[PDB]
Each structure stands twice: as structure tokens, then as C-alpha cells.
Amino acid sequence: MLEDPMSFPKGFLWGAATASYQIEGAWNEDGKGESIWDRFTHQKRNILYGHNGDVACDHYHRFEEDVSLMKELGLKAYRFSIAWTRIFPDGFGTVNQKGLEFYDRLINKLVENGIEPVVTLYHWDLPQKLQDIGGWANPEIVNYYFDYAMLVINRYKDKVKKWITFNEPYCIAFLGYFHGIHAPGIKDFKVAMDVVHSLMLSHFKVVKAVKENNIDVEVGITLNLTPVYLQTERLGYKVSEIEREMVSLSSQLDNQLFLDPVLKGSYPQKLLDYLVQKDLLDSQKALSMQQEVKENFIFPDFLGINYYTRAVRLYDENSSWIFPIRWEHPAGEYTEMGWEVFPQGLFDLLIWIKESYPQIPIYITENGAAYNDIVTEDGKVHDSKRIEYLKQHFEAARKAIENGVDLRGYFVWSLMDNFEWAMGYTKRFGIIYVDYETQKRIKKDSFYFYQQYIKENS
Amino acid sequence: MSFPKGFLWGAATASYQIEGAWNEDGKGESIWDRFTHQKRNILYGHNGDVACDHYHRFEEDVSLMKELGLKAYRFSIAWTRIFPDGFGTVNQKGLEFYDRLINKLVENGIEPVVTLYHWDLPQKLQDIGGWANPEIVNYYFDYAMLVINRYKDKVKKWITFNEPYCIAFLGYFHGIHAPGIKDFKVAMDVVHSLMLSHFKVVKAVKENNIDVEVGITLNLTPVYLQTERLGYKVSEIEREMVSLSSQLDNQLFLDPVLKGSYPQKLLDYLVQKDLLDSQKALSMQQEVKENFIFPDFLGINYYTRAVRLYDENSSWIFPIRWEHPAGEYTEMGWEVFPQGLFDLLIWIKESYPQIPIYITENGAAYNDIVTEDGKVHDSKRIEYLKQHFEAARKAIENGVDLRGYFVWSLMDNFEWAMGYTKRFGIIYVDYETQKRIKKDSFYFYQQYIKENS
Ligand SMILES: OC[C@H]1O[C@@H](O)[C@H](O)[C@@H](O)[C@@H]1O
Ligand SMILES: OC[C@H]1O[C@@H](O)[C@H](O)[C@@H](O)[C@@H]1O
Numbered sequence: 053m054l055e056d057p058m059s060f061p062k063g064f065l066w067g068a069a070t071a072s073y074q075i076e077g078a079w080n081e082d083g084k085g086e087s088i089w090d091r092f093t094h095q096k097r098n099i100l101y102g103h104n105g106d107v108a109c110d111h112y113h114r115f116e117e118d119v120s121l122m123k124e125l126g127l128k129a130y131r132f133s134i135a136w137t138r139i140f141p142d143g144f145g146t147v148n149q150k151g152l153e154f155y156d157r158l159i160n161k162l163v164e165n166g167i168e169p170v171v172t173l174y175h176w177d178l179p180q181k182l183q184d185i186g187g188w189a190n191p192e193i194v195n196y197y198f199d200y201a202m203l204v205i206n207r208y209k210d211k212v213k214k215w216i217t218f219n220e221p222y223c224i225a226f227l228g229y230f231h232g233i234h235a236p237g238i239k240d241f242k243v244a245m246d247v248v249h250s251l252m253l254s255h256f257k258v259v260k261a262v263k264e265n266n267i268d269v270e271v272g273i274t275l276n277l278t279p280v281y282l283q284t285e286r287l288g289y290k291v292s293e294i295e296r297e298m299v300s301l302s303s304q305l306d307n308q309l310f311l312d313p314v315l316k317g318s319y320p321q322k323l324l325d326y327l328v329q330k331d332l333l334d335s336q337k338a339l340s341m342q343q344e345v346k347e348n349f350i351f352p353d354f355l356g357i358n359y360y361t362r363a364v365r366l367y368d369e370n371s372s373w374i375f376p377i378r379w380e381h382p383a384g385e386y387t388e389m390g391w392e393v394f395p396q397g398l399f400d401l402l403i404w405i406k407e408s409y410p411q412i413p414i415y416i417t418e419n420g421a422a423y424n425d426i427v428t429e430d431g432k433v434h435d436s437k438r439i440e441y442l443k444q445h446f447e448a449a450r451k452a453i454e455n456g457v458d459l460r461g462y463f464v465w466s467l468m469d470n471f472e473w474a475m476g477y478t479k480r481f482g483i484i485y486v487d488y489e490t491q492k493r494i495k496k497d498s499f500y501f502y503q504q505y506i507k508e509n510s
Numbered sequence: 511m512s513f514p515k516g517f518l519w520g521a522a523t524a525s526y527q528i529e530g531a532w533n534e535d536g537k538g539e540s541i542w543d544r545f546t547h548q549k550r551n552i553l554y555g556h557n558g559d560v561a562c563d564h565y566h567r568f569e570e571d572v573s574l575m576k577e578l579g580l581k582a583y584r585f586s587i588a589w590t591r592i593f594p595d596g597f598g599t600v601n602q603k604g605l606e607f608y609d610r611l612i613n614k615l616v617e618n619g620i621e622p623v624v625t626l627y628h629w630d631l632p633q634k635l636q637d638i639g640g641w642a643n644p645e646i647v648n649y650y651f652d653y654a655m656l657v658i659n660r661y662k663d664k665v666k667k668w669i670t671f672n673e674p675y676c677i678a679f680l681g682y683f684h685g686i687h688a689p690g691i692k693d694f695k696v697a698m699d700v701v702h703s704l705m706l707s708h709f710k711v712v713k714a715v716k717e718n719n720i721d722v723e724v725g726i727t728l729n730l731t732p733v734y735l736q737t738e739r740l741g742y743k744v745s746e747i748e749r750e751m752v753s754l755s756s757q758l759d760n761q762l763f764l765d766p767v768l769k770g771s772y773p774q775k776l777l778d779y780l781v782q783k784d785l786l787d788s789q790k791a792l793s794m795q796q797e798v799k800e801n802f803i804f805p806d807f808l809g810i811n812y813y814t815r816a817v818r819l820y821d822e823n824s825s826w827i828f829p830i831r832w833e834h835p836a837g838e839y840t841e842m843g844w845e846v847f848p849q850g851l852f853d854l855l856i857w858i859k860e861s862y863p864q865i866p867i868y869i870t871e872n873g874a875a876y877n878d879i880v881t882e883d884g885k886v887h888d889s890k891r892i893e894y895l896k897q898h899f900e901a902a903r904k905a906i907e908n909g910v911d912l913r914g915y916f917v918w919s920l921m922d923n924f925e926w927a928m929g930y931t932k933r934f935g936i937i938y939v940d941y942e943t944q945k946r947i948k949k950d951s952f953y954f955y956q957q958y959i960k961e962n963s
């Protein structure tokens with residue numbers, strides 16, 4: 053007998069996500085200090101086409117129009133980040149009132165319109181003045197971050213009930229400090245590992261203070277997770293032990309390095325051991341890292357997940373990577389990022405978290421796709437592939453819920469086309485198209501699709 | 511709007527990829543027998559010792575061709591089956607194999623098209639420098655003329671080389687193909703040995719009034735600018751540097767083959783970057799000019815395009831990087847882009863002297879699964895072929911002298927450094943049993959040939 057389909061729970065947070073550097077512009081206005089991304093994009097050869105976020109989507113100026121679009125869409129929630137440099141131009145010291153006033157006005161406008169604000173405290177825009185003294189590799193950054201975080205939490209806790217300490221610490225550490233393709237452009241694995249640990253301790257400090265002081269907000273963190281699959285199993289071959297081990301270690305670096313500390317109070321020990329055995333990490337640091345996460349661990353209120361695609365990997369002795377593995381690209385649909393469209397990966401990932409970690413509310417804090425959108429003569433954007441991407445992932449999410457995953461919300465990346473970091477403006481993820489010459493917002497077909505989807509699933 | 515009368519609908523294979531019997535009947539060792547027998551060279555330690563065992567099973571395979579309704583079949587002759595040491599003693603068992611294959615093809619009304627060299631140089635000749643040793647040209651020529659003279663009554667189309675780009679750069683620069691050397695200057699030597707080898711064969715055929723056609727197969731990758739995809743203005747430096755990268759892929763072999771000179775701006779760039787001795791640049795142009803002869807046809811292997819853009823940070827020999835456009839990709843990580851085949855063919859027609867063109871390879875790798883009822887529902891391969899057939903048709907409609915189309919491949923086979931992990935066949939091969947299973951694409955193509963002939 054047909055029992056009602058499990059649907060999205062009541063109160064499920066259908067949302068859209070942005071980040072301060074990617075949309076705000078006004079990079080030097082009203083006392084805002086220089087961020088590491090201001091510095092990074094103003095230097096040669098770091099960004100495609102020499103693009104920068106000086107203006108971006110001009111959201112600092114046009115936020116009222118953007119909240120109006122959010123209201124039209126029927127978003128239950130909006131995830132955005134606060135620019136540390138608008139609050140503390142120098143990272144610490146004097147507070148910039150005009151920065152507070154911007155966020156006061158944005159947050160109030162959201163609440164007036166019935167949209168739940170969800171704030172990312174750190175989405176990659178460290179004050180350049182703190183980078184000048186080591187940045188995340190300097191242990192004292194932990195305290196400067198904490199002071200910033202508690203200031204904005206105490207200011208906005210009446211209206212903002214969900215706080216994300218960090219967006220994607222994997223990217224911050226390894227892209228910012230190992231690969232150097234993101235600000236601050238450093239290229240040193242051991243420094244990247246110091247950063248990993250600084251971010252964890254920062255996170256725990258904020259979670260601990262909210263709990264200890266009985267502040268009525270929820271604190272979580274956002275991790276990018278990329279489910280890893282074996283090409284050997286795709287081919288129907290037998291998997292060797294060495295391949296199983298090496299691919300698993302590569303998966304642990306992507307997926308468990310932050311998940312394990314955040315939810316279980318320890319780093320993945322096999323990965324740390326490997327990194328020590330390959331002289332990529334000092335034994336003394338591996339040991340102290342482990343001791344310190346255990347000492348400081350506290351369980352968060354929710355887990356945020358950024359999901360886009362999977363990886364398919366296989367053993368490769370000849371590889372120049374830190375593990376003897378190579379990637380394979382399975383046949384199928386790919387985005388302008390060269391990312392495989394693989395909704396099953398979202399389902400598999402969510403089931404894996406349910407089965408492998410203590411229960412915790414989960415939010416998908418980012419999911420979306422980049423297509424080379426064209427504005428038609430009638431001023432429309434017929435982004436049918438984006439619609440299909442989103443429909444399929446929404447259904448992956450539904451199915452996870454049907455299997456008892458505690459999913460409480462879903463934030464499309466992005467509300468609007470924006471500055472895609474080192475790729476500049478070349479990658480469009482919006483459900484709203486932004487003409488960068490005029491700053492006109494054009495609703496893509498995906499906007500109308502999402503609007504209807506929310507209506508039918510709330 | 512129709513395919514011309516007598517259009518050669520075909521399928522293509524290569525000796526090392528299908529034959530097996532790698533050391534039977536006195537066959538010499540090739541650089542691919544050596545390459546696959548060293549560790550770390552091929553995925554999963556795969557080798558071509560057995561492959562599809564076509565050496566033994568060719569009669570079944572020819573019946574499948576007949577069933578398919580192929581007008582033509584492109585295959586390669588293994589030099590090491592004919593001259594085990596590359597020169598000297600002629601092996602009769604080798605000759606007898608190609609005798610029987612060619613006879614069986616002709617008997618079934620299928621036109622044989624022979625690639626003389628599809629990458630399997632005798633190891634004995636590599637021992638003395640291979641394609642970098644100028645004497646190779648004469649060893650190759652003697653092999654070529656022997657087989658041409660033997661089979662010219664039944665084989666009217668001969669391809670000197672399959673993809674000299676791959677031979678030189680993948681074999682002698684990147685070293686991911688046999689013989690696994692990594693030296694760009696040696697690769698440029700190889701480029702030139704291949705061009706002179708080509709001209710020598712074309713010349714002897716025409717000079718001796720041998721009634722066959724001689725061509726060459728080049729892999730061509732049409733190149734597109736990400737900057738144009740984004741609707742931005744193109745800078746002069748990007749246009750120049752991406753253009754140089756396309757010339758290395760495309761014009762480096764086309765220009766000598768059809769026009770009798772190498773692309774000068776590329777040579778100049780390679781000289782400027784100490785990638786090519788100035789002296790060699792000069793001699794290359796002079797020697798190609800002296801030996802140039804126009805061929806009877808051009809073979810094109812087309813699979814995909816490249817989208818490129820400028821990158822000063824790049825570690826490649828040009829300051830460029832690739833972009834991956836949104837769309838469908840194959841198991842090779844290749845964009846499905848049938849427009850690239852049309853654009854490429856219009857470009858050949860507009861840029862070079864008129865010449866019959868054959869698509870000597872086109873196809874796609876998908877991760878084929880045999881169902882529980884013994885079928886393979888390769889609907890994506892069907893879609894791939896359908897769209898590329900339509901691009902070929904559009905090229906004809908627009909005045910391109912396209913005279914045939916060979917699907918890569920008749921059957922799943924050894925995909926070089928990827929081993930057996932990539933399946934390009936319209937026929938599935940179970941390597942444990944050597945069973946051939948017709949994929950859905952087999953019947954699609956069967957029907958398409960009947961409707962377009
Ligand atoms: O690359 C697409 C998006 O991926 C997310 O993980 C990041 O948080 C965003 O800042 C980025 O724009
Ligand atoms: O990569 C697929 C195919 O591409 C062609 O260019 C080559 O001639 C074949 O030997 C190869 O298997």
C-alpha cells in the first residue's frame with residue numbers, strides 16, 4: 053500500500069550561497085582593509101584574464117535589489133560570508149563601524165523579508181595585515197579570528213542563528229599554502245599542514261565559547277567532500293591491496309582530514325602516519341596535532357557540505373603527486389569546470405556520513421554547476437543543463453532523506469554569477485546571470501525552475 | 511546531400527592492437543613487444559601478446575565484416591612478420607598470413623586498405639637508432655616496396671604512416687609510447703625521417719607507374735580559443751601562441767605532405783627556444799622541398815578538438831593551457847564535438863590543394879557492459895557515430911572531397927598505454943574466451959551503410 057513519499061522535512065532550508073570576495077566589490081570603500089585576495093588579484097599572473105574582485109557583482113551597493121530577488125525566488129535561507137576586513141581593517145584593533153553598518157542593513161533586510169541569514173565567518177579573505185605576520189601559519193591568528201568571530205556572533209545572534217566557522221579548510225590550507233593557486237599563494241606542504249591545524253583549533257574555540265556562554269546559536273563548519281571511486285572496480289577487475297590502500301589514503305586527505313577532527317576529535321591516523329613516513333610531515337608535529345585536537349575537540353551543531361563531483365582514481369607508481377595515484381575521467385556529462393556530473397556521488401556521500409559518523413544535522417551549503425551561459429535576443433538564459441544538474445542533485449538529496457539521512461537544508465551555489473577565484477569571471481554558477489558591463493541581473497531559466505521546486509517542496 | 515556512389519564505408523584496426531601471436535611463425539620482436547614487456551609502461555601490465563588473436567581468428571572477423579556490409583577494411587601490416595630483423599631474410603609465414611587475409615577480404619567483396627606502418631618498428635632497427643637513424647628510410651622503403659609489389663593487384667590504397675605526430679612525439683619526446691625515448695630534438699629528427707620515408711614510397715610508385723594510390727594518415731585536432739568561447743577580445747600574443755601549438759599538432763605534417771615545406775614560424779620558434787638546432791631547421795626545409803611529392807589521398811584520424819588559452823606560467827613548450835568545455839566526454843576524457851570534424855574538413859578544403867580525403871579513424875571509447883542477455887547497449891557510441899556521420903555528410907554537402915569513412919574500431923583491442931581498459935569496438939571482445947559479441951552500434955552502422963550506399 054502506498055504510504056506518503058518521504059519529502060523534504062517541514063522547515064527545510066532551501067537557500068542560495070555567496071561569498072564576500074566573490075560578489076561584494078567595494079574593495080577599498082568605507083574603511084575596508086586589504087584582504088589577501090585584494091593582494092592576490094592585484095598581482096600579475098594569478099587570475100585568468102587578469103580579473104579581480106574590485107567590483108565583482110557590486111553587491112555592497114546593490115544588496116537591496118539582490119534581497120528583493122531572493123524574496124521573489126522564495127528562498128527560506130541565504131548563506132553569505134562576512135568580510136573580516138570590513139570589520140577589522142587590520143585584523144584586530146579598532147572596529148570599523150561602517151562595516152558593521154553594512155552587515156546590519158543586509159541582515160535586517162533579510163529578516164524583514166522572512167529569509168533566514170546563515171553566515172560564513174571565514175570564506176578565504178584573511179586581512180592582508182595578518183598575512184604579513186604569517187597568516188594562518190602564525191598560532192596567534194587563532195586568537196584574532198576568535199575575537200572577530202565572537203564580536204559578530206554577539207552582534208547578530210538575535211537574527212543569525214546558524215554560523216559556519218570556515219568554508220572548505222581543505223582549500224584554505226592546500227590551495228592557499230601548498231599549491232599556491234589561491235591567496236596567499238604560498239607553496240609549502242608543511243606550512244599547509246600547520247594551517248590545517250590552526251583552522252581546526254580556531255573552529256573548536258568558537259564552538260566551545262558559544263556553548264560555554266550558552267549563546268543561543270548553532271555553530272558548524274563547511275567541508276568540501278569528493279567521494280572517491282576506483283577505476284579498477286569500474287573495469288570489473290580485482291583490486292590489489294596496494295591500490296586499495298593508496299587510493300584510500302588519497303581519499304582520506306580529501307575527505308577525512310577535517311571530517312574526523314570535526315566529528316570525532318582526531319585526525320585520520322593512517323594518513324598522518326603515511327605523511328610522516330614520506331617525510332612530508334614531522335613526526336613531532338603529527339603527534340602534537342593529534343594531542344591538541346583531542347584536547348580541544350567539541351562536537352558542532354551541524355555539518356555543512358559543499359558537493360560538486362566525484363573523483364575516479366587508480367594506482368600509478370610513476371605519479372608525481374604525494375600519493376602514487378592518477379585520475380580517470382569516466383564518460384558522461386561535464387561542466388565548464390571539467391567536473392563530472394554525478395548526482396549519485398551526493399547520495400553515496402550522505403549515506404556514508406550517516407553510517408560512519410555520529411548523527412548530526414547536515415546542510416548542503418553549496419551545490420551547483422558552471423555552464424557557458426548565453427543571453428538570448430529576448431533577454432533570457434535557457435540554461436537547461438543547469439536545470440538538469442540541479443534537478444538530479446535535489447533528487448539525490450531527497451533519496452538520502454528517504455534513507456534516513458538527517459538533511460536539513462540545501463544551498464545552491466550560486467544565487468548569482470560571480471568571481472570564481474583564480475578562474476575570474478570565466479565560470480558562471482549563478483541561477484541569476486550578471487552582465488558585468490551593466491550589473492544587470494537576469495533571471496536564468498534555472499531561477500524559475502528553483503522557484504517552482506521550492507514552492508512544491510516546502 | 512547523399513554520400514557519393516562508391517563511398518568507402520569502412521572499419522579500421524592495427525596489427526599490434528588485434529593480432530596477438532607476438533612470437534609465432536618466426537615473427538621478430540617489435541618496439542611494442544619490448545615496450546609492453548617492461549614494467550610501469552602500460553595500465554594494469556597489459557600487453558599485446560594475445561590481444562584479439564586475430565592472427566588465428568581472421569576468418570571469423572572477415573565474416574563479421576561481410577555481415578556488417580563494409581565496403582572497405584583498413585588494417586596494418588606488421589613489418590616484423592615480414593622482415594623479423596627489419597631487413598635481410600624475408601619470412602614466408604608472415605607473407606602467407608597477409609596473403610590469406612587479403613584473399614579472404616577480396617573474395618568477400620571488401621576493399622583492403624593497408625597501413626604500412628602503424629607504430630610497430632622492428633626492435634632490431636631500434637637497436638641501431640630506429641627512426642633517428644637516416645638508414646631507416648631505406649629499410650622502410652624496401653619493406654614497403656616489397657609488400658606493395660606483392661599485393662598491388664588486390665590492394666589499391668596504401669597508407670605510408672599512421673599518425674607520424676604520435677610516432678615522433680609520443681614515442682621519442684613524451685616516451686609514453688614505444689620506444690619510450692624522451693628527447694625533443696630526436697623527435698624532430700624522427701618527424702623528418704618519416705616525411706622522407708613517405709615521399710620515397712610515393713615517388714617510387716609514381717615513377718614505376720604502379721597502379722595503386724599512396725597516402726598518409728595524420729591525426730588532426732582542430733583548436734579553438736577559450737577567449738572566443740567567452741566572447742572576449744583576443745590578444746595578439748595569445749593568438750600567436752595558441753596558433754603555434756596548433757601548428758605542432760596539425761600543420762607540422764600537413765604542410766610537408768601537401769605543400770612541400772614545414773611551417774616556418776613553428777621551426778623559427780623551436781630554434782628560438784633551443785628546441786631545434788638552427789642547422790637542422792634549414793636542412794629540413796631544403797630536404798622536404800627537394801623530395802616533395804603530392805600524394806593520391808589524405809587520411810585523417812579525428813576524435814576531438816582542443817580548447818586552449820594563453821598561460822605564461824605554463825611548463826609546456828608553448829605558454830598555453832587547455833580548457834574543458836561543458837558537454838559529453840568519452841572514457842578517454844575526450845570531448846564529443848562533431849562540429850570539429852566539419853570545421854576541420856572545410857579548413858582542409860579551403861587551405862590546401864584539392865585532394866581526396868578519407869576519414870581513416872573516428873570512434874569513441876565507452877565502458878561497455880555485456881548484459882545478462884549477451885548484448886551491449888552502447889547507445890552513446892551510436893549517438894557519437896551518428897553525429898560524426900552527419901558532420902561528414904555536411905562536409906560533402908559543402909564541397910569537401912570526402913571519399914570514405916573508417917570507424918575505429920571493428921573490435922575492442924589493445925589501446926596502447928591504456929591497455930585493454932578502453933573499448934572502441936562496434937564488436938565487443940571477451941578477452942578470456944575471445945568471443946566476439948556484436949554491439950548495438952554494429953547494427954546501427956550496418957543499417958547506416960545500407961541506407962547510404
Ligand atoms: O568552485 C565553485 C565554488 O565552490 C565552493 O566550494 C566554494 O566555497 C566557492 O567559493 C566556489 O565558488
Ligand atoms: O586512440 C584510439 C586510436 O586512435 C588512432 O589515432 C590510432 O591510430 C589507433 O591506434 C588508436 O587506438
Ligand SMILES: [Cl-]
Pocket residue numbers: 266267268
Ligand atoms: Cl547571549
